[PDB]
Coordinates of N, CA and C in Angstrom, one line a residue:
Chain A
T1 N 0.8 -1.2 0.0 CA 0.0 0.0 0.0 C 0.9 1.3 0.0
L2 N 0.7 2.1 -1.0 CA 1.5 3.3 -1.2 C 1.1 4.4 -0.2
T3 N 2.0 5.2 0.3 CA 1.8 6.3 1.1 C 1.5 7.6 0.2
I4 N 1.1 8.6 0.8 CA 0.8 9.9 0.0 C 2.1 10.4 -0.6
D5 N 3.2 10.3 0.2 CA 4.5 10.8 -0.4 C 4.9 10.0 -1.6
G6 N 4.8 8.7 -1.5 CA 5.1 7.9 -2.7 C 4.2 8.2 -3.9
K7 N 2.9 8.4 -3.6 CA 2.0 8.7 -4.7 C 2.4 10.0 -5.4
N8 N 2.8 11.0 -4.6 CA 3.2 12.3 -5.2 C 4.5 12.1 -5.9
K9 N 5.5 11.4 -5.4 CA 6.7 11.1 -6.1 C 6.4 10.4 -7.4
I10 N 5.3 9.7 -7.5 CA 5.0 8.9 -8.7 C 4.4 9.8 -9.7
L11 N 3.3 10.6 -9.4 CA 2.5 11.3 -10.3 C 3.3 12.4 -11.0
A12 N 4.4 12.9 -10.3 CA 5.1 14.0 -10.9 C 5.8 13.7 -12.2
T13 N 6.0 12.4 -12.5 CA 6.8 11.9 -13.7 C 5.8 11.5 -14.8
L14 N 4.5 11.5 -14.6 CA 3.6 11.1 -15.7 C 3.7 12.1 -16.9
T15 N 3.7 13.4 -16.6 CA 3.9 14.4 -17.6 C 3.0 14.2 -18.8
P16 N 1.7 14.2 -18.7 CA 0.9 14.3 -19.9 C 0.9 15.7 -20.5
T17 N 0.9 15.7 -21.8 CA 1.1 17.0 -22.5 C 0.1 17.3 -23.6
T18 N -0.6 16.4 -24.1 CA -1.6 16.6 -25.2 C -2.8 15.7 -25.0
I19 N -3.9 16.0 -25.7 CA -5.1 15.3 -25.6 C -5.7 15.1 -27.1
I20 N -6.2 14.0 -27.4 CA -6.9 13.7 -28.6 C -8.2 13.1 -28.4
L21 N -9.1 13.2 -29.3 CA -10.5 12.7 -29.2 C -10.8 11.7 -30.2
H22 N -11.5 10.6 -29.8 CA -11.8 9.5 -30.6 C -13.4 9.3 -30.6
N23 N -13.9 8.6 -31.6 CA -15.3 8.2 -31.6 C -15.5 6.8 -31.2
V24 N -14.5 5.9 -31.4 CA -14.6 4.5 -30.9 C -13.8 4.4 -29.6
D25 N -14.1 3.5 -28.8 CA -13.3 3.3 -27.5 C -11.9 3.1 -27.8
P26 N -11.0 4.0 -27.4 CA -9.5 3.8 -27.6 C -8.8 2.9 -26.6
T27 N -9.5 2.2 -25.7 CA -8.8 1.4 -24.7 C -8.0 0.3 -25.3
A28 N -8.6 -0.4 -26.3 CA -7.9 -1.5 -27.0 C -6.8 -1.1 -27.9
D29 N -7.0 0.0 -28.6 CA -6.1 0.5 -29.6 C -6.2 2.0 -29.7
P30 N -5.3 2.8 -29.1 CA -5.4 4.3 -29.2 C -4.9 4.9 -30.5
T31 N -4.2 4.1 -31.4 CA -3.7 4.7 -32.6 C -4.8 4.9 -33.7
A32 N -5.9 4.3 -33.5 CA -6.9 4.3 -34.5 C -8.1 5.2 -34.1
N33 N -8.9 5.6 -35.1 CA -10.2 6.3 -34.9 C -10.0 7.7 -34.4
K34 N -8.8 8.3 -34.7 CA -8.6 9.7 -34.3 C -9.6 10.6 -35.1
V35 N -10.1 11.7 -34.4 CA -11.1 12.6 -35.0 C -10.6 14.0 -35.0
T36 N -9.7 14.4 -34.1 CA -9.2 15.8 -34.1 C -7.7 15.8 -33.9
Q37 N -7.1 16.9 -34.2 CA -5.7 17.1 -34.1 C -5.3 17.2 -32.6
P38 N -4.1 16.8 -32.3 CA -3.6 17.0 -30.9 C -3.6 18.4 -30.4
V39 N -4.0 18.6 -29.2 CA -4.0 19.9 -28.6 C -3.2 19.9 -27.3
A40 N -2.7 21.0 -26.8 CA -1.9 21.1 -25.6 C -2.7 21.2 -24.4
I41 N -2.2 20.6 -23.3 CA -2.9 20.6 -22.0 C -1.8 20.7 -20.9
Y42 N -2.1 21.3 -19.8 CA -1.2 21.5 -18.7 C -1.7 21.0 -17.4
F43 N -0.9 20.6 -16.5 CA -1.3 20.0 -15.2 C -0.4 20.6 -14.1
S44 N -1.0 20.6 -12.9 CA -0.3 21.1 -11.7 C 0.5 19.9 -11.0
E45 N 1.4 20.3 -10.1 CA 2.1 19.3 -9.4 C 1.2 18.5 -8.5
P46 N 1.6 17.2 -8.2 CA 0.7 16.3 -7.5 C 0.5 16.8 -6.0
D47 N -0.7 16.4 -5.5 CA -1.0 16.5 -4.1 C -2.1 15.6 -3.7
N48 N -2.0 15.0 -2.6 CA -2.9 13.9 -2.2 C -3.1 12.8 -3.2
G49 N -2.0 12.6 -4.0 CA -2.0 11.6 -5.1 C -3.0 12.0 -6.1
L50 N -3.0 13.3 -6.6 CA -3.9 13.8 -7.6 C -3.3 15.0 -8.3
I51 N -3.6 15.0 -9.6 CA -3.2 16.1 -10.5 C -4.4 16.6 -11.3
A52 N -4.5 17.9 -11.4 CA -5.6 18.5 -12.1 C -5.1 19.5 -13.2
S53 N -5.9 19.7 -14.2 CA -5.6 20.6 -15.3 C -5.6 22.0 -14.8
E54 N -4.7 22.8 -15.4 CA -4.5 24.2 -14.9 C -5.4 25.2 -15.6
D55 N -6.1 24.8 -16.7 CA -6.9 25.7 -17.4 C -7.8 24.9 -18.4
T56 N -8.7 25.6 -19.0 CA -9.6 25.0 -20.0 C -8.9 24.8 -21.4
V57 N -9.3 23.8 -22.1 CA -8.7 23.5 -23.4 C -9.8 23.5 -24.4
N58 N -9.7 24.4 -25.5 CA -10.7 24.5 -26.5 C -10.3 23.6 -27.7
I59 N -11.1 22.6 -28.1 CA -10.8 21.7 -29.2 C -11.8 22.0 -30.3
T60 N -11.2 22.0 -31.5 CA -12.1 22.3 -32.7 C -12.3 20.9 -33.3
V61 N -13.6 20.6 -33.6 CA -14.1 19.4 -34.2 C -14.6 19.6 -35.6
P62 N -14.2 18.8 -36.5 CA -14.7 19.0 -37.9 C -16.2 18.7 -38.0
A63 N -16.8 19.2 -39.1 CA -18.2 19.1 -39.4 C -18.5 17.6 -39.6
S64 N -19.7 17.2 -39.2 CA -20.3 15.9 -39.4 C -19.5 14.8 -38.6
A65 N -18.7 15.2 -37.7 CA -17.9 14.2 -36.9 C -18.6 14.0 -35.5
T66 N -18.2 12.9 -34.8 CA -18.7 12.6 -33.5 C -17.5 12.3 -32.6
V67 N -17.7 12.6 -31.3 CA -16.7 12.4 -30.3 C -17.3 11.7 -29.1
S68 N -16.7 10.6 -28.6 CA -17.2 9.8 -27.5 C -16.2 9.5 -26.5
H69 N -14.9 9.6 -26.8 CA -13.8 9.3 -25.8 C -12.7 10.2 -26.0
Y70 N -11.7 10.1 -25.1 CA -10.5 10.9 -25.2 C -9.2 10.1 -24.9
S71 N -8.1 10.7 -25.0 CA -6.8 10.0 -24.6 C -5.7 11.1 -24.4
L72 N -4.8 10.8 -23.5 CA -3.7 11.7 -23.2 C -2.4 11.1 -23.7
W73 N -1.5 11.9 -24.2 CA -0.2 11.5 -24.8 C 0.9 12.2 -24.1
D74 N 2.1 11.6 -24.0 CA 3.2 12.2 -23.4 C 4.0 13.1 -24.4
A75 N 5.1 13.6 -23.9 CA 6.0 14.4 -24.7 C 6.7 13.6 -25.8
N76 N 6.5 12.2 -25.6 CA 7.2 11.3 -26.5 C 6.1 10.3 -27.1
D77 N 5.0 10.8 -27.5 CA 4.0 10.1 -28.3 C 3.7 8.7 -27.8
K78 N 3.3 8.6 -26.5 CA 2.8 7.4 -25.9 C 1.5 7.7 -25.2
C79 N 0.5 6.8 -25.3 CA -0.8 6.9 -24.7 C -0.7 6.4 -23.3
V80 N -1.1 7.3 -22.3 CA -1.0 6.9 -20.9 C -2.3 6.9 -20.2
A81 N -3.4 7.5 -20.8 CA -4.7 7.5 -20.1 C -5.8 7.5 -21.1
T82 N -6.9 6.9 -20.8 CA -8.1 6.9 -21.7 C -9.3 7.0 -20.8
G83 N -10.4 7.4 -21.4 CA -11.7 7.6 -20.7 C -12.8 8.0 -21.7
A84 N -14.0 8.0 -21.1 CA -15.2 8.3 -21.9 C -15.7 9.7 -21.6
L85 N -16.3 10.3 -22.6 CA -16.9 11.6 -22.3 C -18.3 11.5 -21.6
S86 N -18.8 12.6 -21.1 CA -20.1 12.6 -20.5 C -21.2 12.2 -21.4
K87 N -21.2 12.7 -22.7 CA -22.2 12.3 -23.7 C -21.5 12.0 -25.0
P88 N -22.0 11.2 -25.8 CA -21.6 11.1 -27.2 C -22.2 12.3 -28.0
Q89 N -21.3 13.2 -28.5 CA -21.7 14.5 -29.1 C -21.5 14.4 -30.6
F90 N -22.5 14.8 -31.3 CA -22.5 14.9 -32.8 C -22.5 16.4 -33.2
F91 N -21.5 16.8 -34.0 CA -21.4 18.1 -34.5 C -22.0 18.2 -35.9
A92 N -23.1 19.0 -36.0 CA -23.7 19.2 -37.3 C -22.7 20.0 -38.2
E93 N -22.1 21.0 -37.5 CA -21.1 21.9 -38.2 C -19.9 22.1 -37.3
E94 N -18.9 22.7 -37.8 CA -17.7 22.9 -37.0 C -18.0 23.7 -35.8
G95 N -17.4 23.3 -34.6 CA -17.6 24.0 -33.4 C -16.5 23.7 -32.4
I96 N -16.7 24.2 -31.2 CA -15.7 24.1 -30.2 C -16.2 23.2 -29.0
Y97 N -15.5 22.1 -28.7 CA -15.8 21.3 -27.5 C -14.9 21.8 -26.4
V98 N -15.5 22.2 -25.3 CA -14.8 22.8 -24.2 C -14.5 21.8 -23.1
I99 N -13.2 21.6 -22.8 CA -12.8 20.7 -21.7 C -12.6 21.6 -20.4
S100 N -13.6 21.4 -19.5 CA -13.6 22.2 -18.3 C -12.4 21.8 -17.4
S101 N -12.1 20.6 -17.2 CA -11.0 20.1 -16.4 C -10.9 18.6 -16.4
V102 N -9.8 18.1 -16.0 CA -9.5 16.6 -16.0 C -8.4 16.4 -15.0
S103 N -8.6 15.2 -14.3 CA -7.6 14.9 -13.2 C -7.4 13.4 -13.2
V104 N -6.3 13.0 -12.7 CA -5.9 11.6 -12.6 C -5.6 11.2 -11.1
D105 N -6.3 10.1 -10.7 CA -6.2 9.7 -9.3 C -5.4 8.5 -9.1
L106 N -4.8 8.3 -7.9 CA -4.2 7.1 -7.4 C -4.8 6.6 -6.1
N107 N -6.0 7.2 -5.7 CA -6.6 6.9 -4.4 C -7.6 5.7 -4.6
Chain B
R1 N 23.6 -41.3 26.6 CA 23.4 -39.9 26.9 C 22.0 -39.5 26.3
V2 N 21.5 -38.3 26.8 CA 20.4 -37.6 26.2 C 20.8 -36.1 26.2
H3 N 20.8 -35.5 25.0 CA 21.3 -34.2 24.8 C 20.2 -33.3 24.1
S4 N 20.3 -32.0 24.3 CA 19.4 -31.1 23.6 C 20.2 -29.9 23.2
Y5 N 19.7 -29.2 22.2 CA 20.4 -28.0 21.6 C 19.3 -27.0 21.3
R6 N 19.8 -25.8 20.9 CA 18.9 -24.7 20.5 C 19.3 -24.1 19.2
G7 N 18.3 -23.6 18.5 CA 18.5 -22.9 17.2 C 17.7 -21.6 17.2
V8 N 18.0 -20.8 16.1 CA 17.3 -19.5 15.9 C 16.0 -19.8 15.3
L9 N 14.9 -19.1 15.8 CA 13.6 -19.2 15.2 C 13.5 -18.4 14.0
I10 N 13.1 -19.0 12.9 CA 13.1 -18.4 11.6 C 11.7 -18.4 11.0
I11 N 11.2 -17.3 10.5 CA 9.9 -17.1 9.9 C 10.0 -16.5 8.5
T12 N 9.0 -16.7 7.7 CA 9.0 -16.2 6.3 C 7.6 -15.6 6.1
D13 N 7.6 -14.6 5.2 CA 6.3 -13.9 4.9 C 6.4 -13.5 3.4
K14 N 5.3 -12.9 2.9 CA 5.0 -12.6 1.5 C 4.7 -11.2 1.2
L15 N 4.9 -10.2 2.1 CA 4.4 -8.9 2.0 C 4.5 -8.4 0.5
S16 N 3.4 -7.8 0.0 CA 3.3 -7.2 -1.3 C 2.3 -6.0 -1.2
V17 N 2.4 -5.1 -2.1 CA 1.6 -3.9 -2.1 C 1.0 -3.6 -3.4
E18 N -0.1 -2.9 -3.5 CA -0.8 -2.5 -4.7 C -1.5 -1.2 -4.5
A19 N -1.7 -0.4 -5.6 CA -2.2 1.0 -5.5 C -3.6 1.2 -6.1
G20 N -3.7 0.8 -7.4 CA -4.9 1.2 -8.1 C -4.8 2.6 -8.7
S21 N -5.8 3.0 -9.5 CA -5.8 4.2 -10.3 C -7.2 4.6 -10.7
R22 N -7.3 5.9 -11.1 CA -8.5 6.5 -11.5 C -8.3 7.6 -12.5
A23 N -9.3 8.0 -13.2 CA -9.2 9.1 -14.2 C -10.5 9.8 -14.3
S24 N -10.5 11.1 -14.8 CA -11.7 11.9 -14.8 C -11.5 12.9 -15.9
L25 N -12.7 13.4 -16.4 CA -12.7 14.4 -17.5 C -14.1 14.9 -17.7
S26 N -14.2 16.3 -17.9 CA -15.5 16.9 -17.9 C -15.4 18.0 -19.0
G27 N -16.5 18.2 -19.7 CA -16.5 19.2 -20.8 C -17.9 19.3 -21.4
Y28 N -18.1 20.1 -22.4 CA -19.4 20.3 -23.0 C -19.1 21.1 -24.3
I29 N -20.1 21.0 -25.2 CA -20.0 21.7 -26.5 C -20.1 23.2 -26.3
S30 N -19.1 23.9 -26.7 CA -19.0 25.3 -26.3 C -19.9 26.2 -27.2
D31 N -20.3 27.3 -26.6 CA -21.0 28.3 -27.4 C -20.7 29.7 -26.8
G32 N -20.1 30.6 -27.6 CA -19.8 31.9 -27.3 C -18.6 32.1 -26.4
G33 N -18.3 31.1 -25.5 CA -17.2 31.2 -24.6 C -17.4 32.4 -23.6
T34 N -16.3 33.1 -23.3 CA -16.4 34.2 -22.4 C -15.4 35.3 -22.8
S35 N -15.9 36.5 -22.8 CA -15.2 37.7 -23.2 C -15.4 38.8 -22.3
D36 N -14.4 39.5 -21.9 CA -14.5 40.7 -21.1 C -15.3 41.8 -21.7
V37 N -15.1 42.0 -23.0 CA -15.8 43.1 -23.7 C -17.0 42.4 -24.4
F38 N -18.2 43.0 -24.2 CA -19.4 42.5 -24.8 C -20.4 43.6 -25.1
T39 N -20.4 44.0 -26.4 CA -21.2 45.2 -26.8 C -21.8 44.9 -28.1
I40 N -22.9 45.6 -28.4 CA -23.6 45.6 -29.7 C -22.6 46.0 -30.7
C41 N -22.7 45.5 -31.9 CA -21.7 45.7 -33.0 C -22.4 46.0 -34.3
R42 N -21.7 46.7 -35.1 CA -22.0 47.0 -36.5 C -20.7 46.7 -37.3
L43 N -20.9 46.0 -38.4 CA -19.8 45.5 -39.2 C -20.0 46.0 -40.7
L44 N -19.2 47.0 -41.1 CA -19.3 47.4 -42.5 C -18.3 46.7 -43.4
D45 N -18.5 46.9 -44.7 CA -17.6 46.4 -45.7 C -17.1 47.6 -46.5

């Protein structure tokens, strides 16, 4: 069982840097079903074994596309986290999907 | 004769540890965003 100090020592080295959106579940294969170009994202230093985004990220989605999941990539093009969006969202025309915040837990 | 001896008591164990993980993400389809300046506009050509 890890202590809080070990958890913080751990999370500091994850260093996620970008986010991509998919329409199919990327858990089995994150290289496929990309829908949007990579965008930058920033995180704060760990505390209580938790890291949170420092600001909102505006992602532009092409027309007639759908987004249902996301993924985070390192500074060296490796997928480290995956998850599902609150809703499957269909864009009739080009628009902005707003990422309010995202965090990674070890608790 | 009958003799006895003593040795050191030895015990073995298997201690191991595990952590687990979680992830989160929240967003919505944006509209208008937020701007400090917000006024009626006229746009000529």
